[PDB]
Write a protein that binds this DNA or RNA. Structure first.
Ligand code: K
Ligand code: K
Ligand code: K
Ligand code: K
Ligand code: K
Ligand code: K
Ligand code: K
Ligand code: K
Ligand code: K
Ligand code: K
Ligand code: MG
Ligand code: MG
Ligand code: MG
Ligand code: MG
Ligand code: MG
Ligand code: MG
Ligand code: MG
Ligand code: MG
Ligand code: MG
Ligand code: MG
Ligand code: MG
Ligand code: MG
Ligand code: MG
Ligand code: MG
Ligand code: MG
Ligand code: MG
Ligand code: MG
Ligand code: MG
Ligand code: MG
Ligand code: MG
Ligand code: MG
Ligand code: MG
Ligand code: ZN
Ligand code: ZN
Lengths: 91, 102, 69, 55, 211
RNA sequence: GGAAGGGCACCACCAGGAGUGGAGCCUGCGGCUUAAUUUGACCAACACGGGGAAACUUACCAGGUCCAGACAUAGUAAGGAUUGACAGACUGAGAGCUCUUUCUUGAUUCUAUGGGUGGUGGUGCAUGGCCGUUCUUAGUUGGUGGAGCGAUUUGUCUGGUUAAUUCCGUUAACGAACGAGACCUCAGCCUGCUAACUAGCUAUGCGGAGGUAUCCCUUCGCGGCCAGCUUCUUAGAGGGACUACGGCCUUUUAGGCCGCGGAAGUUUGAGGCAAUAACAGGUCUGUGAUGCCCUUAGAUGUUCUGGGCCGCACGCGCGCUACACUGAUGUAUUCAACGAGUUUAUAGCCUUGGCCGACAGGCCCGGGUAAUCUUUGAAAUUUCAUCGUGAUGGGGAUAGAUCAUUGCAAUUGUUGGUCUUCAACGAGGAAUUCCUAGUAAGCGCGAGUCAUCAGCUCGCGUUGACUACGUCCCUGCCCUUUGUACACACCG
């Protein structure tokens, strides 16, 4: 799905910084509550990550919960060019 | 340095609510304070009646669901610090405490 | 299902081998001359050209149009 | 679709503006006390919510 | 600033949603239940599970992730809601744990009869007064059927059911459909109340021995 | 079983009440019509799917968009894979949907092959869960013993008794486990306990009015957190009924009838919960519950516009309004309960008070996140007049004109006002429903649906009866005996 580079960078930055991320199943929501990016773009990017196993997805009561994995952490570090010392706040 | 401190207690469990009220009353009495209450408001009975069946077949049977809320009011003639110290006592889950002035 | 009218085809952008190449002219001395206007909009900035339509000039980024007679 | 067309119909009221917070179905929504749950979901989750059957 | 009715209803809805989310997330890790305690400027969530090692993860990574996601989803203030993990005492007396164990055994290819008998024996040896396991669905044939296994005391009518009976229902997504498993465990009177209801049965009369 | 015996039930009858079935209309079903008039269901479908659909809901129909087709491989490609867009045309349409004209963006995509995803798409005769029914009745099953070659049987019974497989007893059975009961909720009594400025009473102080007007009496309004109190209101703990006591009948039993007292003597009344075994009963259209099958880009996905679900020779079900004087209309008069209520933005929900207006409604100050404000909170009914047996001042169907509010949109009238029009209907055939006391019936009120719509459902109170307290005649249910050529079990 077509996503702007700035939106993808923001989503990846937030995911790496927080270690987790939730999203209501609202495709037409203008903006994600925690991220300025549209909810649809956030959901689809997270689905893309889950497809290749960068994240674990859970669904309950019309909500998505995404938890980063080790492979996802490595991919986000390489893609954001962050130093190896910096790690998600969860750890 | 004396004020009418209003304490509002709300819970779904009558036993826990009454026990907390008694503990607060005894704590206030032990300090030689003036205690008015507890005043028990009429019980709030949230009622929902929904059809048992998940479809439209069979005899129309209904489930009466009730959620009871019990509220208590306690008035103390003492200072903010002493009422705060009294309310610092342990409170069991399911009981909501609110402390205000007038 | 049955269809009456012919199937519609979604728009596909026409391929221009070098659209940027025709936006500049280079002289022998090395001076560069631009054959198309530049959008005055600050957001577009310098280097953003406007189409030379047969009745107006159109900017592809901000959509600004200037009609000339 | 086009932004001005896709999902452009107002949804400020009516059954289409509300859905069950548990299953997302738009039918038989219990709006009393702000539950916002369809009747089936509410009957399933009443014990957890705190609704007891006395009569 | 909402009314008491809406406040209490929202508390119940939050409890139900958290229960469902925790069940979905910790299905395999084992999830006996959850308890929510509210204190001034602090809320505690206790996850009762049979395998707290998996729930916590390595160095509490999983539990920290769960706390962060719960806070973000439920608008909780930073450093105001915190999660604990707790062992379940006498896991055999919890239907949810036994139902999950039976689900695991059935998904592992174990025979339904053997699995149900093992669960029944474990429940009985764990001190349960009585217990019952029902497995419904397409078993051995395209025609659905029900298998009932029962041993010990059991009550089904009246108020004492709500406290002396602990029951759970679960679904197993097998290759050819869905198998519904129901576990029903009858507790025993406990004067302390830790392992059973702190109330005797209505029709139980005890006469003290004369001097 | 159109076989016998015993017992039981207003989803049976008897004795009766209200009725329904007849009229108008509301609403659901079939049929018909239609582009569609989406569809499930036929005691146990038919105001049911909480299903009162203008848009959405929506699943149907006529059209237009979009991908919200992850991931892997291959192709193309920075000499640009691909996105967006001004103006004109096109289009129902400020959908670049598409074409003309050519600008912008940059590997996020496009193309092909696999694999996914979504689907109120089929299958409830593949399923889970849930619910309904068998079935509101009292029924159901082990262990060890006894009998039989065995299927099976006794326990679980001749009799008495009970609402009860409830008990007393008899006994090849003894001990047990479910169901019943116990249980829990509401209501009924407490001048006894605890506590109430978010509930009241009493007396006092002051003030208004009336009466002899000072003092005295009647009735109102306001203050006393140092006036007192908890009868009235609220809500916690407890008490209270156990047939306790008296007379008869009954096996010296279990128990039954009557009776004083008592708030209560039908299990005090009404509910919740509710066994074994089953139905190819309903639900895939509650579910990110689910197998398989279908479709998956010109889509059965999603969204936008419009229409339809409401269409009217006809038949049926649940209901609302009536046929009138035990009444209609117009005054005066005054007694409830269960409940529900806000994002404060100028303001969103319940709305008090003031002003404007005939009404419908509008404007302005404000109260209430609530025993604090709406709530000082109904009708039937009571009382006095008009009407006078006339389809009449009964009845309010149909229809015209016109004015307001909700909504983006009111036409196929959304709903609500004013005037005007004034249909059948004069008590309803065969048939047929519910009901035994604060019950039937009448009367209204709150909530669910809800931007606006209740003739529906779930509850509430107000006035308040007739008849019976018995039976198995009809319709069925439980047990026993008995016959069977039935076991898909007499719809055999
Ligand atoms: K009639
Ligand atoms: K019905
Ligand atoms: K089923
Ligand atoms: K035996
Ligand atoms: K299916
Ligand atoms: K639903
Ligand atoms: K009979
Ligand atoms: K019987
Ligand atoms: K014969
Ligand atoms: K026979
Ligand atoms: Mg029992
Ligand atoms: Mg019972
Ligand atoms: Mg009769
Ligand atoms: Mg009729
Ligand atoms: Mg039709
Ligand atoms: Mg029946
Ligand atoms: Mg309507
Ligand atoms: Mg539409
Ligand atoms: Mg529609
Ligand atoms: Mg669809
Ligand atoms: Mg079926
Ligand atoms: Mg034997
Ligand atoms: Mg037998
Ligand atoms: Mg009193
Ligand atoms: Mg069937
Ligand atoms: Mg319809
Ligand atoms: Mg009905
Ligand atoms: Mg009154
Ligand atoms: Mg007339
Ligand atoms: Mg009239
Ligand atoms: Mg009948
Ligand atoms: Mg309805
Ligand atoms: Zn520009
Ligand atoms: Zn739901």
């Amino acid at each position: 799905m077509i996503i702007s580079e700035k939106n993808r960078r923001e989503i990846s930055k937030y995911l790496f910084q927080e270690g987790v991320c939730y999203a209501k199943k609202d495709y037409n929501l203008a903006k994600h509550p925690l991220i300025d990016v549209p909810n649809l773009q956030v959901i689809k990017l997270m689905q893309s990550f889950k497809s290749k196993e960068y994240v674990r997805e859970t669904f309950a009561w019309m909500h998505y919960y995404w938890y980063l994995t080790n492979d996802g952490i490595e991919f986000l570090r390489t893609y954001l060019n962050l130093p190896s010392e910096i790690v998600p706040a969860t750890l | 340095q004396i004020h009418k401190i209003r304490i509002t207690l709300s819970s779904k469990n009558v036993k826990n609510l009454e026990k907390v009220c008694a503990d607060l009353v005894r704590g206030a009495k032990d300090k030689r304070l003036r205690v008015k209450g507890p005043v028990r408001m009429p019980t709030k009975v949230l009622n929902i009646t929904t059809r048992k069946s998940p479809c439209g077949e069979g005899t129309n049977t209904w489930d009466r669901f009730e959620l009871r809320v019990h509220k208590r009011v306690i008035d103390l003639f003492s200072s903010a610090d002493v009422v705060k110290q009294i309310t610092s006592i342990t409170i069991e889950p399911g009981v909501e405490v609110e402390v205000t002035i007038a | 299902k049955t269809y009456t009218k012919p199937k519609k085809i979604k728009h596909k952008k026409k391929k221009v081998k070098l659209a940027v190449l025709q936006f500049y002219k280079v002289d022998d001395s090395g001076k560069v001359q631009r054959l198309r206007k530049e959008c005055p909009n600050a957001e577009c900035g310098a280097g953003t050209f406007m189409a030379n339509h047969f009745d107006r000039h159109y900017c592809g980024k901000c959509g600004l149009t200037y009609v000339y007679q | 679709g086009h932004s001005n067309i896709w999902n452009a119909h107002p949804k400020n009221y009516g059954p289409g503006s509300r859905t069950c917070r548990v299953c997302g179905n738009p039918h038989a929504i219990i709006r009393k006390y702000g539950l916002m749950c369809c009747r089936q979901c509410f009957r399933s989750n009443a014990k957890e919510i705190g609704f007891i059957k006395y009569r | 600033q909402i009314s008491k009715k809406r406040k209490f209803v929202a508390d119940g809805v939050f409890f139900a949603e958290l229960n469902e989310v925790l069940t979905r997330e910790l299905a395999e890790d084992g999830y006996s239940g959850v308890e929510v305690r509210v204190t001034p400027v602090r809320t505690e969530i206790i996850i009762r599970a049979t395998r707290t090692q998996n729930v916590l993860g390595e160095k509490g990574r999983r539990i920290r992730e769960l706390t962060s996601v719960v806070q973000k989803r439920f608008k909780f203030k930073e450093n105001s809601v915190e999660l604990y993990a707790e062992k379940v005492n006498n896991r055999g007396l919890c239907a949810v744990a036994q139902a999950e164990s039976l689900r695991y055994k059935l998904l592992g290819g174990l025979a339904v009869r053997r699995a149900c008998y093992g669960v029944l024996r474990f429940i009985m040896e764990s001190g349960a007064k009585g217990c019952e396991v029902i497995v419904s669905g397409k078993l051995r044939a395209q025609r659905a059927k029900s298998m009932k296994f029962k041993d010990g005391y059991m009550i089904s009518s009246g108020q004492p059911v709500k406290e002396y009976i602990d029951s759970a229902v679960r679904h197993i997504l097998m290759r050819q459909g869905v198998l519904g498993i129901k576990v029903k465990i009858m507790l025993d009177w406990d004067p302390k109340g830790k392992q059973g209801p702190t109330t005797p049965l209505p029709d139980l009369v005890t006469i003290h021995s004369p001097k």
